Design a protein that fits this description.
Chain A: It holds the Pfam family Ribosomal_S17e. The structure is cut from a larger assembly and holds chains A, B, C, D, E and F. Chain A is mostly helical. Chain A has 3 helices and no strands. The longest helix of chain C has 18 residues. Classes of the chains: A mainly alpha, B alpha/beta, C alpha+beta, D alpha+beta, E alpha+beta, F mainly beta. Chain B binds 2 RNA strands through helix 1, helix 2, helix 3 and helix 4.
RNA sequence: GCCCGAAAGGGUUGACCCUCCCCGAAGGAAACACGGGCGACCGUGGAGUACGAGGGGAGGUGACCGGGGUUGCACCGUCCGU
RNA sequence: CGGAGUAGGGGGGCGGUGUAAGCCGUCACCCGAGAGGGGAACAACCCAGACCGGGGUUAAGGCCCCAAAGUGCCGGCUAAGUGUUACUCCAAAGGGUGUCCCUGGCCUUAGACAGCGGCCCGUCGAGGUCAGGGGCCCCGAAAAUGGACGGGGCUUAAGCCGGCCGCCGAGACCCCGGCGCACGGACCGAUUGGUCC
């Protein structure tokens, strides 16, 4: 089935293009993914949203 | 054109991504060049860059390697190193790039892209220096 | 004389037979047992070679003199049975070239002597009682310094069993 | 590693207010207020009800050393805003008495070894110097600046050209933060 | 239930054998085995063939001799 | 318009095949299912409007690229250009 | 890409291009559904399907193709005899 | 029975000699007399032996950009740009409370520093102290035109250790179609043969 490499790559490109509309909130991230992306699957969209949430967590914090 | 803010980005990774963009065919602008970082020890980094700047042809200095002293030119030169520079294809791809220190009034009023693969946060060892500090050590204007 | 890295290794055939070697030299070493010889000591401290080796009689004699002077100044002849176990039987040769004829008819004339030793082989031994293990180890170190390759020391009891760790822990 | 969750704790005294603003420590007390930036990857400084707590959740030796160092620095800040620090210097000479005087942000020393030129030491802001004959006092609110001022007053008198078994003139520290210097 | 295991064995480096005893937290012993392999390989540069395990026996949290595991288990 | 970018010729670092080409589709859905284009025709336009026609053969890698055959092959003036899928 | 192209070469008894249909070597997917694995991934079904070098056939528009000279891009290539 | 060419060999492994480089032999894999795919380029190191046009799968090796394919996964180490070197073509004896591990003894509820008080107690009252061995790194470590991990550059790596999962990549291997050669055969020529199987 659909692999996580595709998800991480697409989420990484979305975040790169728009690092101003994505936040630490899972549901707002879902909504903004649905808005700014032309995907046609809740599975793919929600996975992208989760990975974007992790991205924001990391880019805010840092070791 | 794709405008990228360099604040808090690792130089070589930024340059790799930008070079691949250029070869695929996009126009790229980079702002805030002085705020990208280089990891490692201050003295080793400074020594390397000084050695670079002191390279010259012994029979004619009007010829010879011209390694930069400015931050924007340093970034540009890293990118150029990451391209095929002895071909028309790479010459065009490199012509398609522009780098700026700060954010000039022209670009003032826009939202800037970033790069995830390149960001100061993937690091864990605090040893790091700034390109602006390198430029100051070398004696260049900004 | 010539550096010892020339004679260190053991890659050449054995050359130990004097009824055929013309002009071979005598040894510069005559004493191999020092101290007290009939005193039945407790601890036996023995050196061991880390890899195969070829030791010059010069090095052997220097080791002897230094270690014996140390043990005399510190322990006393009444103690410390000191023994060297290996004898120099190899003959070393040098090509007589340096008017000259270079590499014409190169077969060396004899110059000196050396002892051959294999891996994990005993070279010398100090027999001593408990109250002088410090000086026995000092002698081990001094001898270690004057050797072409590296060596390790071990300790043995009566019945010849290894008690090195137990004796090293408790000083 | 060494342990799991290394954690050090400091008890806050009478009227000392301790605050964190992300990597800085603000310390207010009866006298003065101090700030200091302390950061290391993985070390967290946060305030409980009445405690300063320094934490790292899987540490090595160097992290342990970092933590203990930060604890010592915070304790110094607290003690400083509570009481203060006081260093002491002693003046000695064999021939050519020299005069030490305070001029604004500088201490000036004249007639050292008979030189026609004066030596100068820089006083840092927040420190006060008092000269009463052969004894000098550096009083202040922060230990680093106080010790640095004292060290500058000392290093303004150092010789390199003649044997010091015979040429011994100068100014010397005798008491660090209430701790005599002994050989 | 998360179990505490104790591992005993020997490893050989440069022709010299050396015994070892360790303690781990895990659900099974296969995880423990993989972790032991990886850790000894890293810290002493030993391949898996030169590592021999004799015993992976389950113990209780309070009869242990490792501070990290002891604090993680209380 | 259901288009893709021409990236490179096929081969290794030292040699190349000039009748085969690597294509990157731009739509995220086609990139997620690039194998559902195997067998499709794909066209490139020349500066004079002429048409060169090729065919998508199989997948290339795991990121979402595809391989295409173009006999008669493409010129080097088409390596960072757009191509239209049918 | 620009230029030449009468004859000796093909071609209105149809050049080139377009659309659909049948067979098909070696080889050979994917979406999706159910499970194993910390994980990168994998297994089962879809499926020997879609596709596939070539081999054949049906309908449309109607005039060049092959060849030659020079040049542009990509990659390769350190002369001949002894 | 007839016609020759060869009487300077070299790389790689083994042996005698030699300070060594080299000299002399030996084996008979390679170059010579051997295309193609890799090692940055390399006569002989790795894959692999070549009629022509095509379609596929692998090998050596590789997957941050140059450059086709992973900014791949799990556990750990290094802070010195150490390193980023299978070989061709890489500095040691001796040292290091630098860090990560293993083992074996000795003290412990008042121990091992400092301290109130001249082997003693009231307090700082919780674990500490000696020996061996291993991994990585550091010191030891100086050269001449300006400069070499192939370059850019890289620090929970784009390095190292122990393992794993996918992909890219030859004229090698599989497949379709064409040319020739060797051997055998059938039929057929007004001379050294021809058509086909």
């Amino acid at each position: 089935n659909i692999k996580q490499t595709f998800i991480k790559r697409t989420a990484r490109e979305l975040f790169d293009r728009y690092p101003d509309k994505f936040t630490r909130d899972f549901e707002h991230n879902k909504k903004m993914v649905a808005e700014l992306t032309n995907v046609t699957s809740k599975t793919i969209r929600n996975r992208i949203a989760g990975y974007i949430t992790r991205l924001v967590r990391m880019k805010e914090e840092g070791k | 054109m794709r405008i990228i803010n360099a604040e808090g980005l690792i130089l070589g990774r930024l340059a790799s991504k930008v070079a691949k963009m250029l070869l695929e065919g996009e126009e790229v602008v980079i702002v805030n060049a002085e705020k990208a970082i280089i990891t490692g020890n201050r003295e080793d980094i400074f020594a390397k860059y000084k050695q670079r700047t002191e390279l010259r042809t012994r029979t004619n200095p009007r010829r010879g390697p011209f390694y930069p002293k400015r931050s924007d030119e340093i970034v540009r030169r890293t990118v150029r190193g990451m391209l095929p520079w002895k071909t028309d294809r790479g010459r065009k791809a490199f012509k398609r790039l522009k780098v700026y220190v700060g954010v000039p009034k022209e670009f003032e009023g826009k939202e800037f892209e970033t790069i995830s693969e390149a960001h100061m946060s993937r690091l864990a060892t605090p040893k790091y220096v700034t390109v602006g500090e390198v430029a100051k050590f070398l004696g260049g204007k900004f | 004389l010539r550096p010892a890295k020339i004679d260190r290794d053991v890659d050449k055939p054995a050359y130990t037979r004097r009824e055929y070697i013309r002009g071979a030299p005598g040894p510069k070493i005559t004493i191999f047992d020092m101290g007290n010889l009939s005193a039945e000591f407790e601890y036996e401290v023995s050196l061991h070679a880390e890899q195969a080796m070829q030791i010059r009689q010069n090095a052997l004699e220097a080791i002897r003199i230094q270690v014996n002077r140390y043990l005399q100044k510190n322990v006393g002849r009444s103690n410390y049975h000191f023994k060297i176990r290996v004898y120099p039987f190899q003959v070393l040769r040098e090509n007589p070239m340096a008017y000259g004829n270079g590499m014409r008819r190169p077969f060396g004339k004899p110059i000196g002597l050396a002892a051959r030793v294999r891996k994990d082989q005993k070279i010398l031994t100090v027999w001593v009682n408990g109250q002088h293990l410090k000086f026995a180890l000092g002698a081990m170190h001094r001898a270690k310094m004057k050797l072409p390759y590296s060596a390790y020391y071990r300790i043995y009891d009566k019945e010849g069993n290894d008690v090195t760790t137990k004796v090293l822990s408790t000083m | 590693p060494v342990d799991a969750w290394i954690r050090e704790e400091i008890e806050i005294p009478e009227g000392v207010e301790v605050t964190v603003e992300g990597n800085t420590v603000k310390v207010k007390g009866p006298k003065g207020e101090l700030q200091r930036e302390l950061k290391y990857p993985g070390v967290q400084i946060f305030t409980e009800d009445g405690k300063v707590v320094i934490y790292k959740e899987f540490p090595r030796k160097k992290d342990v050393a970092i933590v203990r160092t930060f604890k010592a620095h915070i304790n110094n800040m607290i003690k400083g805003v509570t009481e203060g620090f006081k260093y002491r210097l002693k003046v000695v000479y064999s021939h050519f008495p020299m005069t030490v005087k305070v001029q604004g942000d500088e201490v000036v020393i004249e007639n050292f070894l008979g030189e026609k030129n004066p030596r100068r030491a820089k006083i840092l802001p927040g420190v006060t110097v008092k000269v009463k004959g052969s004894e000098i006092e550096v009083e202040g609110i922060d230990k680093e600046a106080v010790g640095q001022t004292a060290a500058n007053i000392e290093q303004a008198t150092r010789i390199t050209k003649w044997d010091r078994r015979v040429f011994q003139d100068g100014i010397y520290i005798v008491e660090k933060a209430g701790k005599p210097i002994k050989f | 239930e998360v179990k505490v295991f104790r591992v005993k064995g020997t490893f050989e480096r440069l022709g010299k054998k050396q015994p070892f005893t360790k303690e781990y937290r895990a659900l099974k012993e296969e995880h423990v085995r993989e972790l032991v392999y990886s850790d000894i390989g890293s810290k002493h540069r030993v391949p898996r063939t030169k590592i021999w395990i004799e015993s992976i026996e389950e113990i209780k949290p309070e009869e242990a001799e490792d501070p990290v595991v002891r604090r993680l288990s209380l | 318009v259901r288009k893709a970018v021409v990236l490179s010729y096929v081969g290794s670092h030292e040699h190349r095949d000039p009748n085969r080409v690597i294509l990157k589709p731009l739509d995220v859905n086609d990139r997620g299912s690039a194998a559902r284009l195997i067998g499709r025709k794909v066209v490139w336009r020349t500066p004079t409007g002429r048409k060169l026609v090729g065919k998508i053969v199989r997948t290339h890698g795991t990121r979402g690229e595809v391989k295409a055959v173009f006999k008669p092959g493409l010129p080097g003036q088409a390596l960072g250009d757009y191509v239209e899928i049918l």
